[PDB]
């Protein structure tokens, strides 16, 4: 009945001190836990082992800014300068061996957002339908959205000046280094493509709008 | 030096089973436990089980008894996890990890194995060269209507690595589409042949498309 309780998500302004909490079930208040760091589409990472007194044995590649504290039930992650690259889900685990039978248990994780960060504006790459795809009476327009932070964009397409909802498919952002990247596609027919005079990929990021247009005429 | 290397992406059919493999290296297999963990939807991790590779002694999360079977092969130095009678819920990234016989930290982790449980139709990608519309030029490559994931996409078979961006895939009606861009100098393209290389192992297809002006 071992139960690590964490809070779903935590927000700290950059540079400031971040203390994270893994409250242990009252019954097992004495246990050593591990801490783990999970970034999206990457194996989680051993951060430290953390005893009931405060003793912390930080794992390899865990720099000085990460430290450990303990307070009865609760077990703490302290990160000195809440730098951009610390943005992650912090998951704590515990091990128990009742009768030569070992069990390991994870808290739900805590999603750390770092705030007061300067933004990067999305830059746009658009491609028109290949002659090859056109020969097939299909036209996919391609909007590639790179070098943006933080990860939230909304993407819309317009045909001349009118929104297109139909045949629009937009990716989830993915972390490339300290910025993000996403794709959007507008699935038309070759005629729909040859009819219009323009088509527009519109990207909305943190109050800002970036637009790049194609001319089918070229 | 100490790595865990897990078996590749697996497409499994609902009601069938899958064997995922985790090979240890650059430490003594028999003097550590291999643990297995499931990436949970949204956020979090889910403990499956532990093998002691010396004795074959296994424990499990109650929820994985009858579902997960952990074997270990001393000869090959490889820990295996059988997952049985799979449904959509078993579709996840699974991580083998290593820890001390002392019930401690999962210190080293594998790269993950992505399991897809679906009955959707394995479909090779239609691949289209994306020449620039209308000193330097950005070329593209569209990978339309493939299933399952993954594909591997390179430029000149990895020989062109500088200026490559390969964008996250979208998924619509059990079909993936993905695009990739590269920026070269006008002295390179089009005087040199430049191809995107799209391998889809599940359909056993490989395509190289030349970008022509």
Coordinates of C-alpha atoms in Angstrom, one line a residue:
Chain A
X1 CA 0.0 0.0 0.0
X2 CA 3.0 2.3 -0.9
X3 CA 1.7 5.7 -2.3
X4 CA 3.9 8.6 -3.5
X5 CA 1.6 11.7 -3.9
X6 CA 2.9 14.5 -6.1
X7 CA 1.0 17.6 -7.5
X8 CA 0.1 17.2 -11.3
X9 CA 1.8 20.5 -12.4
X10 CA 4.1 23.3 -10.9
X11 CA 5.1 26.7 -12.3
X12 CA 8.2 28.7 -11.2
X13 CA 9.6 32.0 -12.8
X14 CA 13.1 31.4 -14.4
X15 CA 16.2 31.6 -12.1
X16 CA 14.1 31.3 -8.9
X17 CA 14.4 28.3 -6.5
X18 CA 12.1 25.3 -7.3
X19 CA 11.2 22.8 -4.4
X20 CA 9.2 19.8 -5.5
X21 CA 7.3 17.5 -3.0
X22 CA 6.7 13.7 -2.9
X23 CA 4.7 13.0 0.2
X24 CA 5.1 9.3 1.3
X25 CA 2.3 7.2 2.7
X26 CA 2.2 7.8 6.5
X27 CA 2.9 4.0 7.1
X28 CA 6.3 4.2 5.1
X29 CA 7.4 7.7 6.3
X30 CA 11.0 6.4 6.9
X31 CA 11.7 5.1 3.3
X32 CA 14.5 6.2 0.8
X33 CA 13.0 7.2 -2.6
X34 CA 14.7 7.9 -6.0
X35 CA 13.9 11.0 -8.1
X36 CA 13.6 10.8 -11.9
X37 CA 13.5 13.5 -14.7
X38 CA 11.3 12.7 -17.8
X39 CA 11.4 14.9 -21.0
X40 CA 9.0 14.0 -23.9
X41 CA 10.1 11.2 -26.3
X42 CA 13.3 10.5 -24.2
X43 CA 14.0 7.8 -21.5
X44 CA 13.5 9.0 -17.9
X45 CA 16.7 9.7 -16.0
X46 CA 17.9 8.8 -12.4
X47 CA 18.3 12.2 -10.7
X48 CA 19.1 11.1 -7.0
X49 CA 18.5 8.6 -4.2
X50 CA 17.1 10.5 -1.2
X51 CA 17.2 9.1 2.4
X52 CA 14.9 10.1 5.4
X53 CA 17.6 12.5 7.0
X54 CA 18.5 14.5 3.9
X55 CA 21.3 12.4 2.5
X56 CA 21.2 12.7 -1.3
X57 CA 23.4 10.7 -3.8
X58 CA 22.7 12.6 -7.1
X59 CA 23.1 10.4 -10.2
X60 CA 25.7 11.1 -13.0
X61 CA 25.2 14.2 -15.2
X62 CA 22.9 15.8 -12.5
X63 CA 24.7 19.1 -11.9
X64 CA 25.1 21.0 -8.6
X65 CA 21.8 23.0 -8.9
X66 CA 19.9 19.7 -8.0
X67 CA 19.9 18.9 -4.2
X68 CA 17.9 16.7 -1.8
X69 CA 16.0 17.4 1.6
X70 CA 13.6 15.1 3.7
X71 CA 10.9 16.2 6.3
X72 CA 9.0 13.3 8.0
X73 CA 6.6 12.0 5.3
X74 CA 7.5 14.6 2.5
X75 CA 10.7 14.2 0.3
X76 CA 12.0 17.3 -1.6
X77 CA 13.7 18.0 -5.0
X78 CA 15.5 21.4 -4.8
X79 CA 16.7 22.9 -8.1
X80 CA 18.8 26.1 -7.5
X81 CA 18.3 28.0 -10.8
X82 CA 15.1 26.9 -12.4
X83 CA 16.8 27.0 -15.9
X84 CA 14.9 26.5 -19.2
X85 CA 16.3 22.9 -19.6
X86 CA 14.9 21.8 -16.2
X87 CA 11.4 21.9 -17.8
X88 CA 10.2 18.3 -17.5
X89 CA 8.0 15.9 -15.5
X90 CA 9.8 15.1 -12.2
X91 CA 8.8 11.5 -11.0
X92 CA 9.7 10.0 -7.6
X93 CA 9.8 6.2 -7.0
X94 CA 10.2 3.9 -3.9
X95 CA 11.2 0.2 -3.4
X96 CA 10.0 -2.4 -0.8
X97 CA 10.9 -6.1 -0.1
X98 CA 8.2 -7.6 2.3
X99 CA 9.1 -11.4 2.0
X100 CA 11.8 -11.6 -0.7
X101 CA 9.1 -10.1 -3.0
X102 CA 10.3 -6.7 -4.3
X103 CA 7.8 -3.9 -5.4
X104 CA 8.7 -0.5 -7.0
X105 CA 6.1 2.4 -7.0
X106 CA 6.0 5.8 -8.9
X107 CA 4.1 9.0 -8.0
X108 CA 1.9 10.5 -10.8
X109 CA 4.7 12.9 -11.8
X110 CA 4.9 16.8 -11.5
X111 CA 5.0 18.8 -14.8
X112 CA 7.3 21.8 -14.3
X113 CA 6.6 24.9 -16.5
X114 CA 9.3 27.7 -16.3
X115 CA 7.7 31.2 -16.7
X116 CA 9.0 34.7 -17.5
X117 CA 11.0 33.1 -20.5
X118 CA 11.6 35.2 -23.6
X119 CA 9.7 33.8 -26.7
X120 CA 11.0 32.6 -30.1
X121 CA 8.6 33.3 -33.0
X122 CA 7.8 30.5 -35.4
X123 CA 9.4 30.7 -38.8
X124 CA 7.3 29.1 -41.7
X125 CA 8.3 26.8 -44.6
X126 CA 5.5 26.1 -47.1
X127 CA 5.6 23.8 -50.1
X128 CA 3.1 23.4 -52.9
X129 CA 1.8 20.2 -54.4
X130 CA 4.4 18.2 -56.4
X131 CA 3.5 17.9 -60.2
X132 CA 3.7 14.1 -59.3
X133 CA 0.9 14.3 -56.6
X134 CA -1.1 16.7 -59.0
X135 CA -1.0 14.0 -61.8
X136 CA -3.0 11.9 -59.2
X137 CA -5.8 14.7 -58.7
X138 CA -4.6 15.4 -55.1
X139 CA -2.8 18.5 -53.7
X140 CA -1.2 18.4 -50.2
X141 CA 0.2 21.9 -49.1
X142 CA 2.9 21.6 -46.4
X143 CA 3.5 24.1 -43.6
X144 CA 6.6 23.5 -41.5
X145 CA 6.8 25.5 -38.2
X146 CA 10.3 25.6 -36.6
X147 CA 12.2 27.5 -33.8
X148 CA 9.3 28.4 -31.5
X149 CA 9.0 28.5 -27.7
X150 CA 7.0 27.8 -25.7
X151 CA 5.2 24.9 -27.4
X152 CA 1.7 26.4 -27.9
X153 CA 0.7 27.3 -31.5
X154 CA -2.7 27.1 -33.3
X155 CA -2.6 26.7 -37.1
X156 CA -5.3 27.8 -39.6
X157 CA -5.2 27.8 -43.4
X158 CA -7.1 30.3 -45.6
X159 CA -7.8 29.7 -49.3
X160 CA -8.0 33.3 -50.8
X161 CA -9.2 35.0 -47.6
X162 CA -11.6 32.4 -46.3
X163 CA -10.8 29.8 -43.6
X164 CA -10.4 26.1 -44.6
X165 CA -11.2 23.5 -41.9
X166 CA -11.6 20.5 -44.3
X167 CA -8.5 18.4 -45.0
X168 CA -6.3 20.3 -42.4
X169 CA -4.0 18.1 -40.2
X170 CA -1.7 19.8 -37.6
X171 CA 1.0 17.9 -35.5
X172 CA 1.7 18.2 -31.7
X173 CA 4.8 20.3 -31.1
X174 CA 8.0 18.4 -30.4
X175 CA 11.1 19.7 -28.4
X176 CA 14.2 20.1 -30.7
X177 CA 16.7 21.5 -28.2
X178 CA 15.4 24.6 -26.3
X179 CA 12.7 25.4 -29.0
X180 CA 9.8 23.4 -30.7
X181 CA 8.8 22.3 -34.2
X182 CA 5.4 21.4 -35.7
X183 CA 3.9 20.6 -39.2
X184 CA 0.5 21.3 -40.9
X185 CA -1.0 19.9 -44.1
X186 CA -4.0 21.0 -46.2
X187 CA -5.3 18.1 -48.3
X188 CA -7.0 19.6 -51.5
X189 CA -7.9 18.3 -55.0
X190 CA -5.7 19.3 -58.0
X191 CA -8.7 21.5 -59.1
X192 CA -9.2 23.2 -55.7
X193 CA -5.4 23.9 -55.9
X194 CA -5.4 25.3 -59.6
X195 CA -8.7 27.4 -59.0
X196 CA -7.5 29.6 -56.2
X197 CA -5.0 32.5 -56.5
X198 CA -3.4 32.1 -53.1
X199 CA -3.5 29.7 -50.0
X200 CA -2.2 30.8 -46.6
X201 CA -0.7 29.0 -43.6
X202 CA -1.5 31.1 -40.5
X203 CA 0.3 30.3 -37.2
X204 CA -0.8 31.9 -33.9
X205 CA 1.9 32.0 -31.1
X206 CA 1.5 33.8 -27.8
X207 CA -0.4 36.8 -29.2
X208 CA 1.7 36.9 -32.4
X209 CA 0.7 35.8 -35.9
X210 CA 3.0 34.5 -38.7
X211 CA 1.6 33.9 -42.2
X212 CA 3.2 32.5 -45.4
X213 CA 1.3 32.2 -48.7
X214 CA 1.7 30.1 -51.9
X215 CA 0.6 31.3 -55.5
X216 CA -0.6 28.2 -57.5
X217 CA 0.1 30.4 -60.6
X218 CA 3.8 30.9 -60.0
Chain B
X1 CA 29.9 2.2 -21.6
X2 CA 26.9 0.7 -19.6
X3 CA 23.9 0.6 -22.0
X4 CA 20.5 -1.1 -22.3
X5 CA 19.5 -1.5 -26.0
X6 CA 15.8 -2.5 -26.5
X7 CA 14.2 -4.3 -29.5
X8 CA 12.7 -2.1 -32.3
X9 CA 9.1 -0.8 -32.7
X10 CA 6.5 -3.6 -32.8
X11 CA 3.1 -3.5 -34.6
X12 CA 1.1 -6.3 -32.8
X13 CA -2.6 -7.3 -33.6
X14 CA -5.2 -7.1 -30.9
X15 CA -5.5 -10.5 -29.2
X16 CA -2.0 -11.6 -30.2
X17 CA 1.2 -11.2 -28.1
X18 CA 4.6 -9.5 -28.5
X19 CA 8.2 -10.4 -27.2
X20 CA 10.3 -7.2 -26.5
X21 CA 14.1 -7.7 -25.9
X22 CA 16.5 -5.7 -23.7
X23 CA 20.3 -6.5 -24.2
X24 CA 22.7 -5.4 -21.4
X25 CA 26.4 -4.5 -22.1
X26 CA 29.6 -3.3 -20.3
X27 CA 28.6 -4.7 -16.8
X28 CA 28.0 -8.1 -15.2
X29 CA 24.4 -9.2 -16.0
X30 CA 24.0 -11.7 -13.1
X31 CA 24.9 -9.0 -10.4
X32 CA 21.9 -6.6 -11.1
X33 CA 18.1 -6.8 -11.5
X34 CA 16.4 -5.8 -14.8
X35 CA 13.1 -3.9 -14.2
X36 CA 10.3 -3.1 -16.7
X37 CA 8.2 0.1 -16.7
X38 CA 5.3 1.4 -18.9
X39 CA 4.9 5.0 -20.1
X40 CA 1.4 6.1 -18.9
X41 CA -1.0 8.2 -21.0
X42 CA -0.5 12.0 -20.4
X43 CA 2.3 11.8 -17.8
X44 CA 3.7 9.2 -15.4
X45 CA 5.3 5.7 -15.3
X46 CA 3.9 2.3 -14.4
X47 CA 6.0 -0.5 -12.9
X48 CA 5.6 -3.9 -14.5
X49 CA 8.2 -6.2 -12.9
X50 CA 11.8 -7.3 -12.0
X51 CA 13.9 -10.3 -13.0
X52 CA 17.0 -11.4 -11.1
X53 CA 18.9 -12.8 -14.1
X54 CA 21.0 -15.1 -11.9
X55 CA 18.2 -17.3 -10.5
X56 CA 15.2 -16.3 -12.8
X57 CA 13.4 -14.9 -9.7
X58 CA 10.6 -12.6 -10.8
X59 CA 8.0 -10.3 -9.0
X60 CA 5.3 -8.2 -10.6
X61 CA 2.7 -5.4 -10.1
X62 CA -0.5 -7.4 -9.3
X63 CA -2.0 -5.7 -12.6
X64 CA 0.7 -7.4 -14.8
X65 CA 0.4 -11.0 -13.4
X66 CA -0.9 -13.1 -16.4
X67 CA -0.1 -10.2 -18.7
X68 CA 3.7 -9.9 -18.4
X69 CA 6.3 -12.8 -18.5
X70 CA 10.0 -11.8 -17.8
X71 CA 12.7 -14.3 -19.0
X72 CA 16.5 -13.7 -18.9
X73 CA 19.1 -15.5 -21.1
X74 CA 22.6 -15.5 -19.4
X75 CA 24.3 -16.7 -22.7
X76 CA 22.9 -13.8 -24.9
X77 CA 22.9 -11.5 -21.8
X78 CA 19.4 -10.4 -22.8
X79 CA 16.2 -9.8 -20.6
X80 CA 12.9 -10.5 -22.5
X81 CA 9.3 -9.3 -21.7
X82 CA 6.4 -11.2 -23.2
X83 CA 3.1 -9.2 -23.2
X84 CA 0.0 -11.3 -23.9
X85 CA -3.5 -10.9 -25.5
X86 CA -2.9 -7.2 -26.3
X87 CA -5.6 -4.5 -26.6
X88 CA -5.3 -0.8 -27.6
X89 CA -4.4 -0.1 -23.9
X90 CA -1.1 -2.0 -24.3
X91 CA -0.1 0.5 -27.0
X92 CA 2.7 2.4 -25.3
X93 CA 6.5 3.0 -24.9
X94 CA 7.9 0.2 -22.6
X95 CA 11.3 0.8 -20.8
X96 CA 13.6 -1.9 -19.4
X97 CA 15.8 -0.4 -16.6
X98 CA 18.6 -1.7 -14.3
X99 CA 18.9 -1.5 -10.5
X100 CA 20.9 -3.0 -7.6
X101 CA 19.8 -6.3 -6.0
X102 CA 19.4 -4.0 -3.0
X103 CA 15.9 -2.8 -4.1
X104 CA 17.3 0.6 -5.2
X105 CA 17.5 3.1 -8.1
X106 CA 16.7 2.4 -11.7
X107 CA 20.1 3.9 -12.7
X108 CA 20.4 3.0 -16.5
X109 CA 17.4 2.9 -18.9
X110 CA 16.9 1.5 -22.5
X111 CA 15.9 3.9 -25.4
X112 CA 12.3 2.5 -25.2
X113 CA 10.3 0.1 -27.4
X114 CA 7.1 1.7 -29.0
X115 CA 4.3 -1.1 -29.2
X116 CA 1.3 -0.3 -31.5
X117 CA -1.7 -2.6 -31.0
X118 CA -4.0 -2.0 -34.1
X119 CA -5.9 -3.9 -36.8
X120 CA -5.5 -1.0 -39.3
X121 CA -4.0 -1.7 -42.7
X122 CA -0.1 -1.7 -43.0
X123 CA 0.3 0.9 -45.9
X124 CA 3.6 2.0 -47.5
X125 CA 4.2 5.8 -47.8
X126 CA 3.6 7.6 -51.0
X127 CA 6.7 9.8 -51.2
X128 CA 6.8 13.1 -53.1
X129 CA 9.8 15.4 -53.9
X130 CA 9.0 19.0 -52.7
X131 CA 10.9 21.4 -54.9
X132 CA 11.0 25.0 -53.8
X133 CA 8.0 27.2 -55.0
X134 CA 8.5 29.6 -58.0
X135 CA 22.8 31.5 -53.3
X136 CA 20.8 28.9 -51.3
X137 CA 17.5 26.8 -51.4
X138 CA 15.3 24.7 -49.0
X139 CA 14.2 21.4 -50.5
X140 CA 11.4 19.2 -49.0
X141 CA 10.1 15.6 -49.0
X142 CA 6.5 14.6 -48.1
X143 CA 5.7 11.1 -46.7
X144 CA 1.9 10.7 -47.2
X145 CA -0.4 8.0 -45.9
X146 CA 1.7 5.3 -44.1
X147 CA 0.9 2.9 -41.2
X148 CA 2.2 1.9 -38.8
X149 CA 5.0 4.1 -37.3
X150 CA 7.9 4.2 -37.7
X151 CA 9.6 5.5 -40.9
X152 CA 13.3 6.5 -41.1
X153 CA 13.9 9.4 -43.4
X154 CA 17.4 10.6 -44.4
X155 CA 18.9 12.8 -47.2
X156 CA 21.5 11.2 -49.6
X157 CA 21.2 8.2 -47.2
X158 CA 22.6 10.2 -44.2
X159 CA 25.5 11.7 -46.2
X160 CA 23.6 15.0 -46.2
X161 CA 23.1 15.7 -42.4
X162 CA 23.8 19.6 -42.3
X163 CA 20.5 21.6 -42.5
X164 CA 18.0 18.8 -42.1
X165 CA 14.8 19.3 -40.2
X166 CA 12.3 16.3 -40.0
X167 CA 9.0 17.5 -38.5
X168 CA 6.6 15.6 -36.2
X169 CA 4.1 13.4 -38.0
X170 CA 0.3 13.9 -38.1
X171 CA -2.1 11.0 -37.7
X172 CA -5.6 10.9 -39.4
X173 CA -7.9 7.9 -40.0
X174 CA -5.1 5.3 -39.1
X175 CA -2.7 7.0 -41.6
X176 CA 0.5 9.0 -40.8
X177 CA 1.9 12.0 -42.9
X178 CA 5.4 13.5 -42.3
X179 CA 7.5 16.1 -44.1
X180 CA 11.2 16.9 -43.9
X181 CA 13.3 19.9 -45.2
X182 CA 16.9 20.4 -45.9
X183 CA 18.7 23.7 -46.8
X184 CA 21.7 23.5 -49.3
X185 CA 23.5 26.1 -51.4
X186 CA 22.6 26.7 -55.1
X187 CA 26.1 25.4 -56.0
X188 CA 25.0 22.0 -54.6
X189 CA 21.4 21.7 -56.0
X190 CA 20.6 21.1 -58.7
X191 CA 24.1 20.3 -60.1
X192 CA 24.2 17.4 -57.6
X193 CA 21.6 14.7 -57.2
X194 CA 19.8 15.0 -53.8
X195 CA 17.2 12.4 -52.6
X196 CA 15.1 11.8 -49.5
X197 CA 15.3 8.0 -48.5
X198 CA 12.1 6.7 -46.9
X199 CA 12.3 3.2 -45.3
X200 CA 9.0 1.7 -43.8
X201 CA 10.2 -1.7 -42.4
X202 CA 6.6 -2.9 -41.7
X203 CA 5.8 -2.8 -45.5
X204 CA 9.5 -3.8 -46.2
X205 CA 9.7 -0.8 -48.6
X206 CA 12.6 1.6 -49.2
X207 CA 12.1 4.7 -51.5
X208 CA 14.7 7.3 -52.7
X209 CA 13.0 10.3 -54.4
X210 CA 15.2 12.8 -56.4
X211 CA 14.4 16.5 -56.0
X212 CA 14.2 17.9 -59.6
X213 CA 13.8 21.7 -60.2

